[model samples]
Target: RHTFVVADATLPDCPLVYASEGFYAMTGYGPDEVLGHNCRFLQGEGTDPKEVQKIRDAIKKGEACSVRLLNYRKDGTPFWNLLTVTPIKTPDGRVSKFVGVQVDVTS
Candidate 1:
Protein backbone atom coordinates (compact mmCIF):
# COMPACT_ATOMS: atom_id res chain seq x y z
CA ARG A 1 0.00 0.00 0.00
CA HIS A 2 2.88 2.38 -0.70
CA THR A 3 5.00 3.71 -3.55
CA PHE A 4 7.85 1.36 -4.33
CA VAL A 5 10.34 0.19 -6.96
CA VAL A 6 12.20 -3.10 -7.24
CA ALA A 7 15.63 -3.16 -8.87
CA ASP A 8 18.32 -5.57 -9.86
CA ALA A 9 21.25 -5.76 -7.49
CA THR A 10 23.88 -7.08 -9.92
CA LEU A 11 22.66 -5.40 -13.05
CA PRO A 12 24.92 -2.69 -14.37
CA ASP A 13 24.24 0.49 -12.46
CA CYS A 14 21.39 -1.07 -10.45
CA PRO A 15 18.58 -0.46 -12.89
CA LEU A 16 14.91 -0.78 -11.97
CA VAL A 17 13.04 -4.04 -12.47
CA TYR A 18 9.48 -3.26 -11.39
CA ALA A 19 7.49 -0.44 -9.79
CA SER A 20 4.34 -0.22 -7.75
CA GLU A 21 1.26 1.56 -9.05
CA GLY A 22 1.26 4.00 -6.16
CA PHE A 23 4.35 5.54 -7.73
CA TYR A 24 2.06 6.88 -10.41
CA ALA A 25 -0.01 8.65 -7.78
CA MET A 26 3.13 10.09 -6.23
CA THR A 27 5.16 11.13 -9.30
CA GLY A 28 2.76 11.21 -12.24
CA TYR A 29 5.12 8.76 -13.92
CA GLY A 30 4.79 5.02 -14.21
CA PRO A 31 7.01 1.94 -14.23
CA ASP A 32 7.20 1.03 -17.90
CA GLU A 33 9.06 4.18 -18.92
CA VAL A 34 11.14 4.49 -15.78
CA LEU A 35 12.48 0.94 -15.75
CA GLY A 36 16.09 0.35 -16.85
CA HIS A 37 16.97 3.81 -15.54
CA ASN A 38 18.33 4.74 -12.19
CA CYS A 39 15.58 6.23 -10.03
CA ARG A 40 17.70 9.37 -9.82
CA PHE A 41 16.39 10.38 -13.24
CA LEU A 42 13.06 11.21 -11.61
CA GLN A 43 14.50 13.97 -9.50
CA GLY A 44 14.98 17.70 -10.07
CA GLU A 45 17.93 19.70 -8.78
CA GLY A 46 19.86 21.63 -6.07
CA THR A 47 18.88 19.37 -3.16
CA ASP A 48 19.97 16.10 -4.71
CA PRO A 49 23.65 15.61 -4.04
CA LYS A 50 23.10 16.05 -0.33
CA GLU A 51 20.89 12.97 -0.26
CA VAL A 52 22.46 11.47 -3.35
CA GLN A 53 25.71 10.97 -1.53
CA LYS A 54 23.89 9.03 1.15
CA ILE A 55 22.01 6.85 -1.29
CA ARG A 56 25.17 6.22 -3.27
CA ASP A 57 26.94 5.20 -0.11
CA ALA A 58 23.99 3.08 0.88
CA ILE A 59 23.91 1.31 -2.47
CA LYS A 60 27.60 0.61 -2.38
CA LYS A 61 27.45 -0.56 1.20
CA GLY A 62 24.33 -2.64 0.62
CA GLU A 63 22.57 -0.81 3.41
CA ALA A 64 19.13 0.73 3.72
CA CYS A 65 18.25 4.42 3.52
CA SER A 66 15.46 6.72 4.62
CA VAL A 67 15.58 10.34 3.57
CA ARG A 68 13.37 13.22 2.55
CA LEU A 69 14.15 15.34 -0.49
CA LEU A 70 12.78 17.09 -3.52
CA ASN A 71 12.02 15.46 -6.85
CA TYR A 72 9.99 15.99 -10.02
CA ARG A 73 7.57 14.30 -12.31
CA LYS A 74 8.22 13.86 -16.03
CA ASP A 75 6.31 17.08 -16.76
CA GLY A 76 8.60 19.03 -14.42
CA THR A 77 6.24 19.52 -11.52
CA PRO A 78 7.79 19.40 -8.06
CA PHE A 79 7.04 17.20 -5.07
CA TRP A 80 8.60 16.17 -1.80
CA ASN A 81 9.88 12.62 -1.77
CA LEU A 82 10.54 10.59 1.31
CA LEU A 83 12.44 7.60 0.02
CA THR A 84 13.24 4.52 2.10
CA VAL A 85 15.13 1.71 0.46
CA THR A 86 16.61 -1.68 1.26
CA PRO A 87 18.52 -4.47 -0.43
CA ILE A 88 16.71 -7.81 -0.74
CA LYS A 89 18.42 -11.15 -0.22
CA THR A 90 16.73 -14.39 -1.07
CA PRO A 91 17.56 -17.86 0.33
CA ASP A 92 21.10 -17.62 -1.00
CA GLY A 93 21.89 -14.86 1.49
CA ARG A 94 23.12 -12.65 -1.31
CA VAL A 95 21.61 -9.37 -2.38
CA SER A 96 19.48 -10.01 -5.40
CA LYS A 97 17.05 -7.15 -5.70
CA PHE A 98 16.49 -3.79 -4.06
CA VAL A 99 13.18 -2.38 -2.95
CA GLY A 100 12.77 1.34 -2.53
CA VAL A 101 9.67 2.97 -1.19
CA GLN A 102 8.53 6.53 -1.85
CA VAL A 103 6.08 8.37 0.33
CA ASP A 104 4.86 11.76 -0.76
CA VAL A 105 5.21 14.37 1.91
CA THR A 106 3.18 16.56 -0.37
CA SER A 107 -0.04 15.90 -2.24
Candidate 2:
Protein backbone atom coordinates (compact mmCIF):
# COMPACT_ATOMS: atom_id res chain seq x y z
CA ARG A 1 0.00 0.00 0.00
CA HIS A 2 1.02 3.57 -0.61
CA THR A 3 0.84 6.53 1.71
CA PHE A 4 -0.54 9.76 0.30
CA VAL A 5 1.03 13.13 1.01
CA VAL A 6 0.01 16.55 -0.19
CA ALA A 7 1.90 19.85 -0.15
CA ASP A 8 0.39 23.18 -1.00
CA ALA A 9 2.77 25.18 -3.14
CA THR A 10 0.65 28.22 -2.41
CA LEU A 11 2.00 28.02 1.10
CA PRO A 12 5.49 28.99 2.20
CA ASP A 13 8.09 26.31 1.52
CA CYS A 14 5.33 24.20 0.06
CA PRO A 15 4.37 22.91 3.46
CA LEU A 16 2.55 19.64 3.72
CA VAL A 17 -1.21 20.12 4.10
CA TYR A 18 -2.28 16.52 4.25
CA ALA A 19 -0.74 13.18 5.07
CA SER A 20 -2.68 9.97 5.03
CA GLU A 21 -3.29 7.68 7.96
CA GLY A 22 -0.96 5.21 6.29
CA PHE A 23 1.73 7.84 6.39
CA TYR A 24 1.38 8.04 10.13
CA ALA A 25 1.76 4.30 10.35
CA MET A 26 4.81 4.33 8.12
CA THR A 27 6.65 7.31 9.54
CA GLY A 28 5.46 7.41 13.12
CA TYR A 29 4.67 11.05 12.67
CA GLY A 30 1.35 12.50 13.61
CA PRO A 31 -0.40 14.88 11.25
CA ASP A 32 0.12 17.75 13.67
CA GLU A 33 3.90 17.26 13.71
CA VAL A 34 4.31 17.31 9.95
CA LEU A 35 1.54 19.47 8.57
CA GLY A 36 3.47 22.70 8.31
CA HIS A 37 6.82 21.32 7.24
CA ASN A 38 8.49 20.32 4.04
CA CYS A 39 8.92 16.62 3.41
CA ARG A 40 12.69 16.89 3.54
CA PHE A 41 12.50 16.12 7.22
CA LEU A 42 12.25 12.51 6.20
CA GLN A 43 15.67 12.65 4.57
CA GLY A 44 18.82 12.14 6.53
CA GLU A 45 22.53 11.35 6.28
CA GLY A 46 22.00 8.15 4.35
CA THR A 47 19.57 9.53 1.79
CA ASP A 48 20.81 9.51 -1.78
CA PRO A 49 21.84 12.88 -3.13
CA LYS A 50 21.14 11.94 -6.73
CA GLU A 51 17.60 10.98 -5.94
CA VAL A 52 17.11 14.14 -3.98
CA GLN A 53 18.38 16.16 -6.93
CA LYS A 54 15.98 14.40 -9.24
CA ILE A 55 13.07 15.38 -7.03
CA ARG A 56 14.27 18.98 -6.92
CA ASP A 57 14.69 19.13 -10.68
CA ALA A 58 11.24 17.75 -11.32
CA ILE A 59 9.66 20.16 -8.87
CA LYS A 60 11.47 23.05 -10.54
CA LYS A 61 10.02 22.03 -13.87
CA GLY A 62 6.57 21.40 -12.47
CA GLU A 63 6.79 17.81 -13.64
CA ALA A 64 6.38 14.38 -12.11
CA CYS A 65 9.20 12.19 -10.84
CA SER A 66 9.81 9.00 -8.95
CA VAL A 67 12.79 7.98 -6.86
CA ARG A 68 13.79 5.40 -4.33
CA LEU A 69 15.67 6.72 -1.36
CA LEU A 70 16.33 6.25 2.29
CA ASN A 71 13.84 7.88 4.63
CA TYR A 72 13.61 7.99 8.38
CA ARG A 73 10.74 7.46 10.72
CA LYS A 74 10.11 9.91 13.53
CA ASP A 75 11.97 7.66 15.90
CA GLY A 76 15.00 7.57 13.55
CA THR A 77 14.51 4.20 12.01
CA PRO A 78 15.49 4.01 8.34
CA PHE A 79 13.30 2.63 5.59
CA TRP A 80 13.44 2.47 1.84
CA ASN A 81 10.94 4.81 0.30
CA LEU A 82 9.70 4.69 -3.25
CA LEU A 83 8.38 8.17 -3.72
CA THR A 84 6.43 9.55 -6.64
CA VAL A 85 5.68 13.23 -6.82
CA THR A 86 3.37 15.01 -9.21
CA PRO A 87 2.59 18.66 -9.58
CA ILE A 88 -1.00 19.73 -9.27
CA LYS A 89 -1.67 22.60 -11.59
CA THR A 90 -4.28 25.26 -11.34
CA PRO A 91 -6.87 26.05 -14.04
CA ASP A 92 -4.34 28.34 -15.74
CA GLY A 93 -1.65 25.65 -15.66
CA ARG A 94 0.24 27.02 -12.71
CA VAL A 95 1.31 24.48 -10.14
CA SER A 96 -0.63 25.09 -6.95
CA LYS A 97 0.25 21.96 -5.08
CA PHE A 98 2.24 18.75 -5.16
CA VAL A 99 0.92 15.27 -4.50
CA GLY A 100 3.24 12.49 -3.43
CA VAL A 101 2.64 8.81 -2.97
CA GLN A 102 5.10 6.94 -0.80
CA VAL A 103 5.61 3.21 -0.71
CA ASP A 104 7.89 1.48 1.74
CA VAL A 105 10.09 -1.02 -0.08
CA THR A 106 12.34 -1.99 2.77
CA SER A 107 11.50 -5.62 2.67
Candidate 3:
Protein backbone atom coordinates (compact mmCIF):
# COMPACT_ATOMS: atom_id res chain seq x y z
CA ARG A 1 0.00 0.00 0.00
CA HIS A 2 1.49 3.30 -1.07
CA THR A 3 0.03 5.48 1.63
CA PHE A 4 -0.08 9.20 1.15
CA VAL A 5 0.58 11.77 3.80
CA VAL A 6 -2.36 13.77 2.63
CA ALA A 7 -4.56 16.59 3.88
CA ASP A 8 -7.67 17.96 2.25
CA ALA A 9 -7.43 21.39 0.63
CA THR A 10 -10.77 21.46 -1.15
CA LEU A 11 -12.58 23.24 1.66
CA PRO A 12 -11.50 26.43 3.40
CA ASP A 13 -12.13 24.58 6.61
CA CYS A 14 -10.82 21.19 5.63
CA PRO A 15 -9.36 18.60 7.93
CA LEU A 16 -6.30 16.44 7.74
CA VAL A 17 -6.53 12.95 6.30
CA TYR A 18 -3.54 10.91 7.30
CA ALA A 19 -2.75 7.29 6.75
CA SER A 20 -3.80 5.18 9.75
CA GLU A 21 -0.53 4.61 11.54
CA GLY A 22 1.14 7.95 10.83
CA PHE A 23 -2.01 9.64 12.11
CA TYR A 24 -1.78 8.02 15.51
CA ALA A 25 1.97 8.19 16.01
CA MET A 26 2.35 11.81 14.98
CA THR A 27 -0.38 13.64 16.83
CA GLY A 28 -1.79 11.09 19.25
CA TYR A 29 -5.06 12.37 17.81
CA GLY A 30 -7.64 9.93 16.66
CA PRO A 31 -9.21 10.24 13.24
CA ASP A 32 -12.45 11.46 14.80
CA GLU A 33 -10.95 14.54 16.46
CA VAL A 34 -8.55 15.36 13.66
CA LEU A 35 -11.14 14.95 10.95
CA GLY A 36 -13.07 18.20 11.40
CA HIS A 37 -10.26 20.53 12.36
CA ASN A 38 -7.39 21.86 10.34
CA CYS A 39 -3.98 20.42 11.11
CA ARG A 40 -3.09 23.83 12.51
CA PHE A 41 -4.66 22.58 15.70
CA LEU A 42 -1.50 20.64 16.29
CA GLN A 43 0.31 23.94 16.40
CA GLY A 44 -0.58 25.15 19.82
CA GLU A 45 -0.09 28.47 21.60
CA GLY A 46 3.67 28.69 21.37
CA THR A 47 4.11 27.74 17.76
CA ASP A 48 6.11 30.20 15.72
CA PRO A 49 3.95 32.42 13.62
CA LYS A 50 6.77 33.21 11.22
CA GLU A 51 7.18 29.57 10.29
CA VAL A 52 3.44 29.08 10.05
CA GLN A 53 3.04 32.13 7.85
CA LYS A 54 5.68 30.91 5.45
CA ILE A 55 3.81 27.66 5.06
CA ARG A 56 0.46 29.41 4.68
CA ASP A 57 1.78 31.68 1.96
CA ALA A 58 3.28 28.80 0.03
CA ILE A 59 0.09 26.81 0.16
CA LYS A 60 -1.86 29.83 -0.94
CA LYS A 61 0.21 29.93 -4.08
CA GLY A 62 -0.04 26.18 -4.64
CA GLU A 63 3.69 25.75 -4.35
CA ALA A 64 5.81 23.18 -2.57
CA CYS A 65 8.06 24.19 0.30
CA SER A 66 9.84 22.68 3.25
CA VAL A 67 10.75 24.15 6.59
CA ARG A 68 11.61 23.11 10.10
CA LEU A 69 8.98 24.14 12.57
CA LEU A 70 8.38 23.98 16.26
CA ASN A 71 5.33 21.81 16.92
CA TYR A 72 4.00 20.56 20.14
CA ARG A 73 3.22 16.96 20.86
CA LYS A 74 -0.02 15.86 22.49
CA ASP A 75 1.70 15.79 25.84
CA GLY A 76 2.67 19.49 25.58
CA THR A 77 6.32 18.98 24.88
CA PRO A 78 7.86 21.14 22.17
CA PHE A 79 9.83 19.48 19.41
CA TRP A 80 11.16 20.18 15.97
CA ASN A 81 9.36 18.59 13.05
CA LEU A 82 10.95 18.80 9.65
CA LEU A 83 7.91 19.47 7.53
CA THR A 84 8.01 18.98 3.81
CA VAL A 85 4.83 20.22 2.16
CA THR A 86 4.02 19.58 -1.45
CA PRO A 87 1.04 20.43 -3.55
CA ILE A 88 -0.69 17.47 -5.12
CA LYS A 89 -2.82 17.84 -8.18
CA THR A 90 -5.85 15.86 -9.14
CA PRO A 91 -6.04 14.43 -12.64
CA ASP A 92 -7.69 17.59 -13.90
CA GLY A 93 -4.86 19.84 -12.59
CA ARG A 94 -6.69 21.15 -9.59
CA VAL A 95 -4.78 21.35 -6.34
CA SER A 96 -6.83 18.95 -4.28
CA LYS A 97 -4.36 17.82 -1.71
CA PHE A 98 -1.51 19.12 0.34
CA VAL A 99 0.84 16.29 1.10
CA GLY A 100 2.91 17.00 4.19
CA VAL A 101 5.61 14.71 5.37
CA GLN A 102 6.51 15.40 8.98
CA VAL A 103 9.49 13.87 10.66
CA ASP A 104 10.48 14.27 14.28
CA VAL A 105 13.95 15.79 14.28
CA THR A 106 14.34 16.28 17.97
CA SER A 107 16.79 13.56 18.71
Best by TM-score: 2
Q: For residues 1-107, could you state the per-residue lDDT of candidate 3 as single tens digits?
A: 11236778897644576655765566676777776567787787777899889999988888998887887767887867788889988889889988877887778
- How much lDDT does candidate 3 score? 0.75
Q: Which ranges of candidate 1 are over 4 A from the true structure?
A: none
TM-score of each: 0.87, 0.96, 0.84
**lDDT of each residue in 1-107, candidate 2, tens digit only:** 88999999887577999999999899999988899999999999999999999998898889999999999999999999999999999899999999999999998
Model 1 C-alpha lDDT per residue in residues 2-66, reported as the tens digit of each score: 68889898886889888887886667776677878788887767567878889988888888988
Best-to-worst order by TM-score is 2, 1, 3
**Which residue pairs collide in model 3, if any?**
none
The better-scoring model by lDDT among 1 and 2 is 2
* Residue range with the least summed lDDT across 10 consecutive positions in model 2: 7-16
lDDT of 2 at 56: 88
Error of 3 at 6 (Å): 1.1
Candidate 2 positional error at 80, Å:
0.3
Off by over 4 Å in 2: none
TM-score of 2: 0.96
Number of backbone clashes in candidate 1:
0
Q: Global lDDT for candidate 1?
A: 0.82
Instruction: Provide the lowest-lDDT 10-residue window in model 1.
Output: 24-33
